[PDB]
Design a protein around this ligand. Structure first.
Ligand code: CLA
Ligand code: CLA
Ligand code: CLA
Ligand code: CLA
Ligand code: CLA
Ligand code: CLA
Ligand SMILES: C=Cc1c(C)c2cc3nc(c4c5[nH]c(cc6nc(cc1[nH]2)C(C)=C6CC)c(C)c5C(=O)[C@@H]4C(=O)OC)[C@@H](CCC(=O)OC/C=C(\C)CCC[C@@H](C)CCC[C@H](C)CCCC(C)C)[C@@H]3C
Ligand SMILES: CCCCCCCCCCCCCCCCCC(=O)OC[C@H](CO[C@@H]1O[C@H](CO)[C@H](O)[C@H](O)[C@H]1O)OC(=O)CCCCCCCCCCCCCCCCC
Ligand SMILES: CC1=C(/C=C/C(C)=C/C=C/C(C)=C/C=C/C=C(C)/C=C/C=C(C)/C=C/C2=C(C)CCCC2(C)C)C(C)(C)CCC1
Ligand SMILES: CC1=C(/C=C/C(C)=C/C=C/C(C)=C/C=C/C=C(C)/C=C/C=C(C)/C=C/C2=C(C)CCCC2(C)C)C(C)(C)CCC1
Ligand SMILES: CC1=C(/C=C/C(C)=C/C=C/C(C)=C/C=C/C=C(C)/C=C/C=C(C)/C=C/C2=C(C)CCCC2(C)C)C(C)(C)CCC1
Ligand SMILES: [Cl-]
Ligand SMILES: [Fe+3]
Lengths: 35, 38, 37, 56, 77, 34, 60, 341, 496, 28, 65
């Protein structure tokens, strides 16, 4: 079963992946605009 | 070179704007700390 | 057999030798006090 | 080999790379050669996972 | 644009001459009404000790750190 | 006080071994000059 | 021993003039390292003709 | 061209500030590292981790603020905001010393991004990257002291804190408990750094006073700024000077400029080796022979034996408040004093 | 000519001479292991492993042989504690002779490869230049590593054709080498559980077989090849230093923090066990449990084995020890001979006072006696004319329970002060100082020497990675001529 | 035996000084 | 060079020596293996450092015996 540490860890892994994903998404977007 | 077009969202624009708003907020706080009565 | 062709001479000049010897003696003097403790 | 920094004599060598070659589409001969080998691979991998579950 | 004529344009005046005081006064109010003491958990200038005991707080556990320091905060320690 | 023999040998090899390496390399370099 | 008993009575770490000194020494090391690295990659080769007791005419 | 190629050439435009692939690791991490120091040395307390005050909101000035370390019970914990200690509460996270780690780790990856930035910049202009290699002396120092050393201690509480008085404290702490001046590796660090400052002053002066174009007007029309200098002085007048003053001089400009690079760097590296040795508390604290000779004849007295007494003092009088989690209580009859010998 | 720090820049374009050089280094390492094993064996003493274990005699390579299943000696002695066994051919001596034999073979084989350095295989068949096939080489060698990883896990560790591995109980009282079946649950990544280690090897050897098959059938992508400069043998070197220094830090860390593979009967206790007060709690627990069921102090303290007490003494803490202090830990305060027993101090009214434990940070620590409610009640003062507590004003006595001195009581100050001055170290032991003539200053245990060394090496190897990566990406900048051109032939000009 | 080592290695350093000043390479 | 009985057996395995497969080939597969590995190392690190807790797991010298 899940324990509070597991849930905090999923929230952390998901939040971090979302920060790198959006970083590279806006870098990719702004290069594609003024390409 | 580097001719000027460069609208509102540019790299140097966000560079001055992520060092500007917290420094002026912190001078706003460091200032109010001087007039604390402890 | 037949000679290796990647064989190359090694060089060492006198000023480098003086630095190296200076390095040997000066480290030796710093560490002899710990080697005898 | 390469030899450089020869203005004062001090020799420095460098590894050489060979020419970069493009791959060219498959030969039937190559396919059977590989087919025997990937079949050999999966048959042995099968046996190893059997040994892993057997030793407990 | 370059930083050699960047504070000579009419843009600088029209916006910053209002946004600067706004966020500066925001930074004043943050401390002046004592919100900082509750956000970062800073103790008030006379709540370093309880009146119950005169010992300093130190959390001696890491997984019950939260309710230990909450217990210290309860008595104004 | 103590007098390690091991300290005597430790310093002895520390100053003899690299120095002889150095002077051998020099003396065989100079014979390549002619 | 001098350093330890000096800090004890005059509290020199909190004295600014020693601080300007420390800044000078860390800064000196930093600028030494930087100057060496920049120049030593920039230079390709230098040469001067040399004779049997002196140096040449064009330091190239 | 594909999107990757378009991204890559957007990143390497000629512009005021260079972004680059390396920029992506450097700039956010650097901003958050630096900014965490600032937000913490202005607001965040340490009444709960050390029993001190260390921020402006509480009273303190520029030399006595700091972002301080965690408590000793926290172990080698990461101190995640989502970890099982904070549990998603920004207040507790500040209270538990959780952001010392934030600053430290973000600054470590900022370091990594900077050295990569030096590589790919130098790759772009096509020069040898010695300055990237020089910059691994600061990385060695940083990781051996701020990361490896307390990972050999029992907690991050014995790590140094980001602040002026906190690191002045680190100096006196190491003096007392490790006798760090008597360690050959720190001596080799001192020799290296002082020698760097020596070469720096001597080279500047020598060059500034063997200038070409001391008479008629400048026959030098470039720089050519990336050359630094070296064109603007005569090697032969300086070499001829120093052969008579000191009796040895350099006759090769390239080797002089390599020596200047070698000295401070090997210097930092050696002191790093020593302090990673202190991390398992292996200490060149005492000469065994001197201790025996002092035990058997107690009229023997050395400048060294004095240093030991002084360090005993530093430990004994500083410990209870520097380690207030141990609960040292020393009755005053057990502390050491000069008038009691 | 060649500078003195560039005398192996000739094997670079020479496959045969390189194989020979690597063979020489292998030969030296094998020779080293064998001869070190004999040296340590000639100077070892297994007559008493309970009050002088092997990590007190300062054995470095001897524990490493004992972990994976050597436990005997052709002399007949055992380190289990046994006397009179036959381990067969494989004793500590056996493996030493094996290694020396393999160094000799390797030395001959190196000499051969250096004589016969030029063969058809090592040369490209298209131009007569050295050619390597670096991806295919990685695949084949990976397949070999995987085959070995799988065999080591499935046959040796689980003891289906091997001896197994060293298993223990948490307090190091009795450990031995035994078969260990794996654990695939979420409890197999718990480094305090040997089953996890076996499951790792089984699984990782299987992944290695698969990756090794993969890397034989698939050629590198065009972009990664020309980016990461593949076909340059100096690429493999940077990458391999990186892996190696990563691996160094992890072994140093797990030796310092402990693991199931680094137990405390092979390399002694850690510092983290002293500072948590692990053994003190064990020992107290036992004494409280016996008194509760019905016992007297003399019976209850006599139920504590000598092994436990010896672990709870700061002299075995590996954070005690200098840097240039040499020699075994027995050279540090003498050889233990017997356990005097647990001391119990009292003052004149008759309560029990307890001595404070010295931390490893302090090199010298005052003797303070505080009660059970944390108020100091006696000390040995530093003063030589001022007291407000003392061993005369409070009439401090010491009694002993268990060990040798059982029911003894000493009254007058000075001998009681001597025992308080031992009690800051925890337990008290009779030492024999005459056989080594020990100086009474501590030394660290093998756990410390291992960690120190490998941390220094890992840090130095980090610089190695940076320098050799520099030389790979910037080959054309350190050299004059880009390797994207063939040798230059006929010159054309252009003149006015 | 220890004092001997100290003064001997120092004696060697000053001899090194002498040779590095009066018997250095010609500058070619 | 010489002809040898073992040299020519290993010859097929060393006669490619510089061949690439065109384009990015199988790089995306590499990426997701590299991502799964990053997550894996974080997991075993966080188990060790006890800021990630799983039931039936006590990171302690206890449960050796
Ligand atoms: C852009 C660069 C960047 C980088 C490199 C980092 C890196 C880091 N941050 Mg972070 N952070 C950033 C931006 C960044 N951050 C920004 C902009 C924010 C604000 C939203 C934050 C907010 C933030 C917080 C609030 C905290 C951190 C913390 C940390 C670290 C602390 C140490 C630790 O425990 O790490 C542990 C390791 C990680 C956190 C890394 C997780 C990595 C992931 C997601 C890999 C996934 C790969 C891939 C997508 C998987 C594919 C799978 C698929 C194929 C199936 C880690 C070094 C923590 C800290 O300081 O603790 C002391 C913390 O609490 N950061
Ligand atoms: C953390 C690092 C750190 C650093 C970088 C420094 C840096 C410094 N400290 Mg220190 N210091 C520190 C920590 C540190 N300190 C701490 C923690 C303490 C407290 C215990 C002190 C206590 C302290 C004191 C008490 C003093 C310093 C002084 C100095 C400096 C003086 C300038 C100098 O170098 O003169 C170096 C001084 C010289 C005299 C050297 C020149 C010698 C000559 C001219 C010799 C030439 C002949 C030669 C021997 C022959 C060669 C022959 C051969 C080639 C053959 C320097 C700025 C000193 C200072 O200000 O001095 C004025 C001083 O008195 N510091
Ligand atoms: C008197 C002479 C003297 C001298 C010359 C030195 C010299 C040295 N000591 Mg020192 N020391 C001395 C006396 C002296 N000491 C005495 C008497 C004491 C009292 C005990 C000490 C105590 C002492 C300690 C405790 C330590 C040293 C260490 C060191 C050395 C490490 C290198 C260094 O400076 O790292 C300094 C720090 C760095 C190089 C890291 C800098 C990192 C960066 C990049 C910061 C960037 C910040 C910036 C704002 C970012 C901008 C970003 C933006 C662009 C976006 C240096 C060799 C250190 C050592 O051995 O470490 C291995 C160490 O831990 N010494
Ligand atoms: C890094 C690899 C390594 C490590 C960790 C060890 C560790 C150990 N060796 Mg060692 N040894 C090694 C390689 C290594 N060995 C090699 C390659 C040789 C050559 C054959 C030896 C030769 C050797 C001898 C002669 C002895 C040991 C013994 C021992 C140990 C027993 C405990 C003891 O008496 O501590 C004492 C600690 C040590 C011997 C190691 C630390 C040494 C010191 C203080 C200095 C280290 C720096 C060194 C002087 C280089 C300085 C360079 C300079 C530029 C500054 C210790 C566990 C001893 C033994 O078995 O006792 C019964 C013993 O007498 N070893
Ligand atoms: C891991 C294996 C490894 C291998 C195969 C190499 C191989 C090479 N290195 Mg490298 N190196 C390594 C690790 C390695 N190194 C590490 C870890 C470091 C960091 C400390 C360096 C730092 C380094 C630099 C900075 C340079 C080289 C150079 C060289 C090359 C020049 C020729 C030569 O061998 O000079 C042979 C001889 C020496 C380098 C001097 C040997 C005398 C010394 C200092 C040691 C004395 C014995 C030693 C202390 C005994 C204990 C060893 C221990 C492991 C047991 C050679 C290709 C040079 C190069 O690329 O030239 C083109 C160059 O400039 N290396
Ligand atoms: C059934 C599946 C399975 C299971 C149960 C395990 C189980 C295990 N693996 Mg794993 N593994 C598997 C499959 C599996 N593996 C597969 C298929 C792969 C890919 C082929 C791997 C790749 C792998 C790697 C790469 C590693 C492991 C390690 C380990 C463990 C080693 C025991 C130990 O001491 O860990 C305790 C150790 C850790 C949890 C390591 C944490 C990581 C860091 C970097 C720690 C460093 C700490 C610190 C900073 C150093 C300070 C030094 C200072 C004091 C001087 C654990 C038992 C690790 C290992 O070798 O451990 C020794 C390691 O790094 N495994
Ligand atoms: C305390 C002494 C000291 C300081 C302060 C320092 C500072 C610096 N060295 C740099 C460079 C160098 N240093 C070098 C050699 C040396 N540096 C040395 C000693 C120091 N060097 C020594 C002795 C040497 C000689 C070997 C070289 C060769 C270089 C460079 O080329 C480089 C440069 O650009 O110089 C102009 C600069 C890198 C700027 C950057 O982009 O960082 C990026 C760093 C980031 C993003 C994070 C840093 C870490 C953080 C966030 C935590 C530390 C604590 C905070 C700063 C909070 C305040 C702390 C208080 C104590 C004030 C920076 C100005
Ligand atoms: C493991 C058991 C077996 C071990 C057997 C091997 C033993 C190891 C022997 C080798 C040891 C390393 C040799 C290092 C010495 C040689 C150095 C050398 O030749 O340099 C010269 C080398 C190479 O220099 C090059 O030489 C070439 C010709 O050979 C050309 O001249 C090149 O132009 C020149 O660059 O450069 C360096 O190594 C750079 C660093 C030099 C360091 C000198 C430090 C300064 C002098 C000492 C300190 C004085 C200050 C003391 C202050 C005291 C105050 C109390
Ligand atoms: C941490 C964190 C974070 C982040 C944050 C940040 C990043 C911040 C920033 C911050 C900042 C970034 C700040 C700044 C500050 C500033 C300051 C502090 C200033 C000072 C001042 C100065 C610099 C000036 C001075 C002067 C001069 C110089 C001259 C004369 C006049 C005067 C005196 C005025 C997050 C979200 C993730 C969440 C978690 C945590
Ligand atoms: C041929 C032959 C043979 C013989 C063999 C032999 C006899 C061998 C020997 C071998 C040996 C017997 C070897 C040895 C080795 C050794 C070594 C190799 C060592 C090294 C060392 C070192 C390297 C060190 C280092 C160091 C130091 C000094 C200090 C610090 C640390 C260190 C560790 C780093 C036989 C009959 C068998 C068989 C057939 C053939
Ligand atoms: C004629 C001649 C010569 C000679 C030659 C010879 C005779 C050589 C030898 C060589 C050799 C002599 C070699 C050998 C090789 C082989 C080996 C060295 C092997 C070994 C093996 C082993 C050791 C194994 C182990 C194992 C494994 C791997 C796995 C699992 C199982 C076991 C553990 C069993 C010379 C040079 C003078 C030159 C002139 C002519
Ligand atoms: Cl004094
Ligand atoms: Fe210059």
């Amino acid at each position: 079963t899940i324990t509070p540490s597991l849930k905090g860890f999923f929230i952390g892994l998901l939040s971090g992946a979302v920060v790198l994903g959006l970083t590279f998404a806006v870098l990719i977007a702004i290069s594609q605009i003024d390409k | 070179q580097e001719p000027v077009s460069y609208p509102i969202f540019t790299v140097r624009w966000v560079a001055v704007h992520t060092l500007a708003v917290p420094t002026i907020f912190f001078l706003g706080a460091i200032a109010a700390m001087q007039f604390i009565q402890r | 057999m037949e000679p290796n062709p990647n064989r190359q001479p090694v060089e060492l000049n006198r000023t480098s030798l003086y630095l190296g010897l200076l390095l040997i003696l000066v480290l030796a003097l710093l560490f002899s006090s710990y080697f005898f403790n | 080999m390469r030899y450089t920094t020869d203005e004062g004599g001090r020799l420095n060598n460098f590894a050489i790379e060979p020419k970069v070659y493009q791959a060219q589409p498959w030969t039937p001969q190559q396919k059977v050669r590989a087919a025997l080998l990937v079949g050999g691979g999966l048959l042995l991998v099968a046996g190893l996972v059997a040994i892993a579950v057997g030793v407990s | 644009r370059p930083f050699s004529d960047i504070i000579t344009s009419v843009r600088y005046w029209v916006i910053h001459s209002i946004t600067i005081p706004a966020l500066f006064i925001a930074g004043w109010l943050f401390v002046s009404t004592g919100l900082a003491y509750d956000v970062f958990g800073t103790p008030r200038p006379d709540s370093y000790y309880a009146q119950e005991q005169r010992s300093i707080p130190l959390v001696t556990d890491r997984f019950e750190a939260k309710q230990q320091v909450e217990t210290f905060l309860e008595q104004l320690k | 006080m103590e007098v390690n023999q091991l300290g005597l040998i430790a310093t002895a090899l520390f100053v003899l071994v690299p120095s002889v390496f150095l002077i051998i390399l020099y003396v065989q370099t100079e014979s390549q000059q002619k | 021993n001098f350093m330890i008993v000096f800090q004890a009575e005059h509290n020199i770490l909190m004295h600014p003039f020693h601080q300007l000194g420390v800044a000078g020494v860390f800064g000196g090391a930093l600028f030494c390292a930087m100057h060496g690295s920049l120049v030593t990659s920039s230079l390709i080769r230098e040469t001067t003709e040399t004779e049997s007791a002196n140096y040449g005419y064009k330091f190239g | 061209r594909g999107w990757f190629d378009i991204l890559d050439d957007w990143l390497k435009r000629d512009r005021f500030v260079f972004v680059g692939w390396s920029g992506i690791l450097l700039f956010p991490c650097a901003y958050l590292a630096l900014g965490g120091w600032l937000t913490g040395t202005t607001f965040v307390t340490s009444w709960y981790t050390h029993g001190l005050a260390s921020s402006y909101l509480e009273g303190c000035n520029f030399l006595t603020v700091a972002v301080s370390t965690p408590a000793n019970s926290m172990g080698h914990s990461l101190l995640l905001l989502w970890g099982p200690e904070a549990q998603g509460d920004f207040t507790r996270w500040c209270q538990l010393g959780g952001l010392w780690t934030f600053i430290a780790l973000h600054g470590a990856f900022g370091l990594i991004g900077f050295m990569l930035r030096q590589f790919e910049i130098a790759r772009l202009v096509g020069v040898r990257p010695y300055n990237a290699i020089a910059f691994s002396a600061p990385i060695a120092v940083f990781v051996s002291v701020f990361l490896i050393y307390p990972l050999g201690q029992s907690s991050w509480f014995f790590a140094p804190s980001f602040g002026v008085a906190a690191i002045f404290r680190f100096l006196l702490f190491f003096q007392g408990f490790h006798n760090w001046t008597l360690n050959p590796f720190h001596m080799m660090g001192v020799a290296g750094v002082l020698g760097g400052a020596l070469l720096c002053a001597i080279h500047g002066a020598t060059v500034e006073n063997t200038l070409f174009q001391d008479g008629e007007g400048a026959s030098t029309f470039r720089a050519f700024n990336p050359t630094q200098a070296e064109e603007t002085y005569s090697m032969v007048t300086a070499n001829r000077f120093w052969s008579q003053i000191f009796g040895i001089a350099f006759s090769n400009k390239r080797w002089l400029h390599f020596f200047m690079l070698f000295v401070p760097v090997t210097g930092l590296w050696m002191s790093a080796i020593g302090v990673v040795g202190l991390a398992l508390n292996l200490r060149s604290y005492d000469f065994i022979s001197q201790e025996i000779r002092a035990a058997e004849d107690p009229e023997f007295e050395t400048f060294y034996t004095k240093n030991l007494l002084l360090n005993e003092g530093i430990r004994a009088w500083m410990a209870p408040q520097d380690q207030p989690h141990e609960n040292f209580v020393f009755p005053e009859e057990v502390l050491p004093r000069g008038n009691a010998l | 000519g060649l500078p003195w720090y560039r005398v192996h820049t000739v094997l670079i374009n020479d496959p045969g001479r390189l194989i020979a050089a690597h063979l020489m280094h292998t030969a030296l390492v094998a020779g080293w292991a064998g001869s070190m094993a004999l040296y340590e064996l000639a100077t070892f003493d297994p007559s008493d492993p309970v009050l002088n274990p092997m990590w007190r005699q300062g054995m470095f390579v001897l524990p490493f042989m004992a972990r994976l299943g050597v436990t005997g000696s052709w002399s007949g002695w055992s380190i289990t504690g046994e006397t009179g066994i036959d381990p067969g051919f494989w004793s500590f001596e056996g493996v030493a002779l094996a290694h020396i034999v393999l160094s000799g073979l390797l030395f001959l084989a190196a000499c051969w490869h250096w004589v016969y350095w030029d063969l058809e295989l090592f040369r490209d068949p298209r131009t007569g230049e050295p050619a390597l096939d670096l991806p295919k080489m990685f695949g084949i060698h990976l397949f070999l590593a995987g085959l070995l990883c799988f065999g080591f896990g499935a046959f040796h560790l689980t003891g289906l054709f091997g001896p197994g591995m060293w298993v223990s109980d948490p307090y190091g009282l009795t450990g031995s080498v035994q078969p260990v079946a794996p654990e695939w649950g979420p409890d197999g990544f718990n480094p305090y559980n040997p089953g996890g280690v076996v499951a790792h090897h089984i699984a990782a050897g299987i992944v290695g077989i698969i990756a090794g098959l993969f890397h034989i059938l698939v050629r590198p992508p065009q972009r990664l090849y020309k980016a990461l400069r593949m076909g340059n043998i100096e690429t493999v070197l940077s990458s391999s230093i990186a892996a190696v220094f990563f691996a160094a830090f992890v072994v140093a860390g797990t030796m310092w923090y402990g693991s199931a593979t680094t137990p405390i009967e092979l390399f002694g206790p850690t510092r983290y066990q002293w500072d948590s007060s692990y053994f003190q709690q064990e020992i107290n627990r036992r004494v409280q449990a016996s008194l509760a069921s019905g016992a007297t102090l003399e019976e209850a303290w006599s139920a504590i084995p000598e092994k436990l007490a010896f672990y709870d003494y700061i002299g075995n803490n590996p954070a005690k020890g200098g840097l240039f202090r040499t020699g075994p830990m027995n050279k540090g305060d003498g050889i233990a001979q017997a356990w005097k027993g647990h001391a119990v101090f009292r003052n004149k009214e008759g309560e029990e006072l307890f001595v404070r434990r010295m931390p490893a940070f302090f090199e010298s620590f005052p003797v303070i006696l505080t009660d059970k409610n944390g108020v100091v009640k006696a000390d040995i003062p530093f003063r030589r004319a001022e007291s407000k507590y003392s061993f005369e004003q409070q009439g401090v006595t010491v009694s002993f329970y268990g060990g040798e001195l059982n029911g003894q009581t000493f009254t007058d100050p000075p001998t009681v002060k001597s025992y308080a001055r031992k009690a800051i170290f925890g337990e008290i032991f009779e030492f024999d100082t005459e056989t080594l003539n020990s100086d009474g200053i501590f030394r660290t245990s093998p756990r410390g020497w291992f960690t120190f060394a490998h941390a220094v090496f890992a840090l130095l190897f980090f610089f190695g990675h940076i320098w050799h990566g520099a030389r790979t990406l910037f080959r054309d900048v350190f050299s004059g001529i880009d390797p994207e051109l063939s040798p230059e032939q006929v010159e054309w000009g252009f003149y006015q | 035996m220890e004092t001997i080592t100290y003064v001997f290695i120092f004696a060697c350093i000053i001899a090194l000084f002498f040779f590095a000043i009066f018997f250095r390479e010609p500058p070619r | 060079a010489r002809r040898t009985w073992l040299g020519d057996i290993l010859r097929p395995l060393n006669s490619e020596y510089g061949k690439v497969a065109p384009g990015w080939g199988t790089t995306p597969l590499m990426a997701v293996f590299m991502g799964l590995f990053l997550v894996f190392l974080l997991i075993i690190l966080e188990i060790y450092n006890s800021t990630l807790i799983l039931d039936g797991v006590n990171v302690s010298w206890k449960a050796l015996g």
